């Protein structure tokens, strides 16, 4: 009864994230430049290369790489940022400005200090500084970036989540009802500036409908909220003393010592610590919507009497059927039908009608039939208020008037002889109900108090409070109900605003975390589906979704619930941040895979003496960059279903073909390896043994640094070859065009908690008033 509360209360808010380093995938790099004819220039040139060439072989592994990249980027994706933090100083600026990142200035310095750079670029480095405008609290900082990097950074800037803050938003963050409750007064001691910001939760209701066929998890959630709610219900105050009440009860009952009586048992369970137990059980159950059973005994007729009050002010749908069926049946047999000479009863076990139903249409008395009508037709009114569903009472219970019909009924039973039964039975019953008649006003005010605290604590709920019977129940002793109904008076007790703010913050944190973890899971699921990841079993992800909901034990959960939950999660859309990041990855993933000079995008085979291309970062290369004409064979299809008949038939008969899939390669840089046709010696291993993993095409990069290049100048032969490689080239580093200006705010501040500036206090609780502007606990 303490681990669960600690699991809840230790759910921190979502730690506000931030970044200090720009997102980057690419970096410049100097390479040589070999002029056409192949020979070398005294000058070099910059190119865009990747950081972290960690791309695997095979296309499936590549798509897993981009999945893990997407997860990394979402981790790095911030919520707010100020650019002045990451800023640095350009050592070569006219106005001694600042640029945005360390690596930016490193690039600028490297380029400026070099010898082979134009004057325009150095000018452009001397002209680039930081601009402010404190009117709008806006800054523009320069930056150097690849266009993918710019895409991600700009998305981070524009789509960051912060909202201006002021005291009006501190109020409106509080629920309506509590501000509208006159019994609470609220002030503060600060005036927040326009500079201030705050992050908002995600209090979106359950997309997953755990109130439908996930009854074990729902029992868990419901229990957790129940035993939280117990922690916030007030403890009663200024109760009646137990001996002072027991003496009245005993003298009213005239307990003879010698003779045996049913009337001693009415003193069973009259202590305090049960009154508070019932008071804390009923409300917590109605808030959590957790069902509860009734343990009791058929000889303590006071329990059966107090059950009347109970079944009035608490709906029959709130209990489990067999328990209140037994209770109603006991009551019918031993208070009601003997009080009109009716039969005892003949109640079938699984009868669809509960005993108070067919009792409503046998007896002939208006008061008792009206009482029974209310009981049988009392039920929670569903109503959506301030975004949240609420299980609201009748509003004939919120005021205490039901108790008056209950009194009418009990008095119209007191005025009935029991012709069937002896004097002592009647005597017992009539005494037992005098004990409650004399507590009438206390009962009225008690009912009002319960309803008041129920709605007041309901106001501090964020998740829709569905009503469904749970697996597991809470025990309710009717002796505690008797104790509450008997020991209560002249003492209103109201939840302190601190308990209210705590019960609100707990639910808010849990609710936001629920929604955010849902978004996580849906993101990874949709991404694995759209990346065609077909071997991936989506089970670990649901474990990561449940371990983060810190109330469930996964060591004892099944493995089919995870996939049902997955089936629900696939249907949910993605949020905007994650979806847009993913779509920025999709339209650019191929371009990233073009880079990473470790794998190539396929190898052509064409038994014809084709020509090598005049690329200038290389010299002559056996490179292809269109893959048009010669047809193509995918490799994942071949590595799934080994059917090497096609490729074998094509290789043995020397048919042109292309092979498509991420494949390694070696850079060979010898003309003697070219003339001898060695790049066609790599494929004979496929037919011997039918694996395609030892497949490393040659990349004949030829230049004036290749140890035999004297031939090329001195015989006038264009290097020709067979079996070209499919691969694009790097993109040249244009400094001016790779430069950008980054907009951001200037010097805001972020606040996580929000109900700290409030300072609340109640009015004096005796002059505490309900919705009807008519006092509660006034019967004196």
């Amino acid at each position: 009864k303490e681990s669960i509360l600690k699991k809840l209360e230790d759910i921190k808010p979502e730690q506000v994230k931030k970044q200090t380093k720009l997102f980057r995938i690419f970096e410049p790099r100097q390479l040589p430049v070999y002029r056409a004819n192949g020979e070398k220039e005294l000058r070099n040139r910059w190119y865009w290369k990747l950081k972290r060439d960690t791309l695997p072989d095979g296309d499936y592994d590549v798509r897993e790489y981009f999945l893990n990249l997407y997860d990394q980027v979402l981790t790095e994706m911030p919520d707010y940022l100020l650019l002045k933090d990451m800023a640095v100083e350009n050592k070569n600026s006219r106005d001694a400005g600042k640029v945005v990142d360390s690596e930016t200035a490193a690039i600028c310095d490297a380029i400026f200090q070099d010898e082979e750079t134009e004057g325009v670029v150095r000018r452009f480095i001397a002209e680039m500084r930081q601009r402010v405008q404190a009117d709008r609290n806006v800054v523009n900082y320069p930056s150097i970036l690849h266009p993918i990097d710019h895409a991600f950074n700009e998305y981070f800037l524009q789509h960051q989540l912060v909202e201006p803050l002021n005291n009006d938003i501190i109020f409106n963050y509080i629920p309506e009802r509590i501000r509208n409750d006159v019994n609470y007064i609220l002030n503060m001691d600060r005036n927040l500036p326009s500079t201030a910001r705050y992050i908002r939760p995600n209090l979106l209701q359950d997309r997953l409908n755990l109130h439908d066929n996930f009854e074990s998890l729902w029992d868990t959630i419901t229990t957790s909220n129940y035993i939280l709610a117990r922690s916030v219900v007030p403890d009663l105050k200024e109760l009646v003393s137990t001996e002072a009440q027991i003496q009245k009860m005993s003298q009213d009952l005239q307990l003879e010592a010698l003779t045996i009586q049913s009337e001693t048992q009415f003193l069973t369970g009259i202590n305090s610590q049960a009154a508070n137990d019932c008071f804390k059980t009923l409300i917590a159950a109605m808030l959590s919507q957790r069902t509860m059973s009734l343990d009791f005994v058929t000889t303590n007729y006071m329990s059966l009497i107090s059950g009347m009050w109970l079944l009035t002010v608490v709906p029959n749908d709130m209990f489990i059927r067999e328990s209140l069926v037994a209770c109603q049946l006991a009551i019918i047999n031993t208070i009601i039908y003997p009080a009109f000479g009716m039969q005892r009863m003949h109640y079938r076990n699984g009868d669809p009608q509960t005993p108070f139903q067919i009792a409503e249409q046998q007896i002939q008395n208006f008061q008792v039939a009206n009482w029974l009508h209310f009981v049988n037709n009392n039920q929670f009114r569903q109503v959506v208020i301030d975004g949240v569903l609420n299980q609201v009472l009748n509003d004939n219970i919120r005021n205490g008037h039901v108790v008056n019909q209950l009194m009418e009924a009990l008095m119209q039973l007191s005025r009935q002889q029991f012709p069937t039964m002896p004097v002592d039975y009647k005597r017992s019953i009539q005494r037992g109900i005098l004990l409650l008649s004399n507590r009438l006003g206390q009962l009225v005010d008690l009912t009002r108090l319960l309803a008041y605290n129920y709605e007041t604590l309901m106001a501090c709920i964020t998740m829709n409070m569905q009503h469904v019977q749970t697996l597991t129940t809470e025990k309710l002793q009717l002796t505690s109900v008797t104790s509450l109904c008997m020991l209560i008076g002249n003492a209103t007790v109201i939840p302190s605003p601190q308990t209210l703010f705590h019960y609100y913050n707990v639910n808010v944190n849990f609710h936001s975390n629920y929604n955010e973890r849902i978004n996580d899971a849906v993101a990874i699921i949709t991404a694995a589906n759209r990346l065609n990841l077909y071997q991936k079993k989506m089970k670990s992800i649901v474990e990561d979704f449940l371990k983060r909901l810190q109330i469930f034990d996964i060591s004892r959960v099944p493995d089919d619930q995870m996939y049902r939950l997955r089936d629900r999660l696939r249907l949910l859309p993605v949020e905007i941040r994650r979806l847009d990041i993913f779509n920025l990855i999709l339209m650019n993933m191929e371009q990233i895979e073009r880079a990473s000079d470790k794998i190539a995008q396929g190898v052509i085979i064409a038994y014809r003496d084709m020509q090598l291309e005049r690329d200038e970062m290389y010299g002559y290369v056996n490179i292809a960059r269109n893959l048009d004409g010669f047809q193509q064979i995918n490799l994942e299809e071949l590595m799934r279903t080994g059917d090497y008949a096609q490729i074998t038939n094509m290789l043995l008969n020397n048919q042109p073909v292309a092979l498509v899939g991420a494949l390694p390669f070696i850079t060979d840089s010898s003309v003697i390896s070219l003339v001898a046709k060695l790049d066609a010696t790599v494929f004979a291993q496929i037919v011997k043994l039918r694996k395609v993993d030892t497949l490393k095409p040659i990349l004949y990069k030829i230049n004036s640094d290749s140890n035999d290049f004297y031939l090329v100048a001195n015989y006038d032969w264009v290097p020709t070859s067979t079996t070209k490689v499919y691969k694009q080239i790097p993109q040249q580093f244009d400094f001016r065009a790779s430069m950008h200006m980054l907009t951001s705010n200037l010097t805001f501040t972020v606040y996580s908690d929000l109900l700290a500036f409030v300072s609340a206090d109640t009015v004096e609780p005796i002059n505490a008033v309900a919705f009807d502007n008519m006092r509660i606990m006034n019967e004196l």
Binding site: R190, T749, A756, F757
Partner: peptide, 14 residues
Amino acid sequence: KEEHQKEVQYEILQ
């Protein structure tokens, strides 16, 4: 507690 929870958020301002 709450007083330290208020103190952090007053101090971000102060």
